[PDB]
Design a protein around this ligand. Structure first.
Ligand SMILES: C[C@@H]1CN(CC(=O)N2CC(C)(C)c3ncc(Cc4ccc(F)cc4)cc32)[C@@H](CN2Cc3ccccc3C2=O)CN1
Ligand code: NA
Ligand SMILES: [Zn+2]
Length: 107
């Protein structure tokens, strides 16, 4: 169970190109869109809807149709430098503030 990569160098440079990542999915039956996953740095493992970020190495699965690739990326892998490059710390903080406040409301 690897620590998340927080450096500015990708863990998996073979998956650094959008198109390389897009090829990993094949026919995608799952509720979240493969282009939206690939744009958020994710590629498919081939095992259910398990994906990994090319840069941080961070893995996620069990995608509900309401879960957004970028939000989940920020929620679980907040140290990812690819996420910071693409989205900015301000998007990151919003998302973080939001998912903590989602929790309050429920209790
Ligand atoms: C999209 C959204 C993500 N959720 C969290 C999730 O997917 N995380 C959070 C955590 C980082 C702790 C985690 N650690 C291991 C795995 C497994 C994995 C192994 C390699 C790989 F390449 C890809 C995935 C997943 C995972 C979903 C809810 N889930 C699903 C689950 C499965 C296992 C453990 C915990 C959880 C969990 O919180 C809801 N959907
Ligand atoms: Na596949
Ligand atoms: Zn990442």
């Amino acid at each position: 169970m690897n620590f998340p990569n927080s450096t500015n160098l990708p863990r998996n440079p073979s998956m650094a190109d959008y198109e390389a990542r897009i090829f990993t999915f094949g026919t995608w039956i799952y509720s979240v869109n493969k282009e939206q996953l690939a744009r958020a740095g994710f590629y498919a493992l081939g095992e259910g809807d398990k994906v990994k970020c090319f840069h941080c190495g961070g893995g996620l699965t069990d995608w509900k149709p309401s879960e957004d690739p970028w939000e989940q990326h920020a929620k679980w892998y907040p140290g990812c430098k690819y996420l910071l490059e693409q989205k900015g710390q301000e998007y990151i903080n919003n998302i973080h503030l939001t998912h903590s406040l989602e929790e309050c409301l429920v209790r």
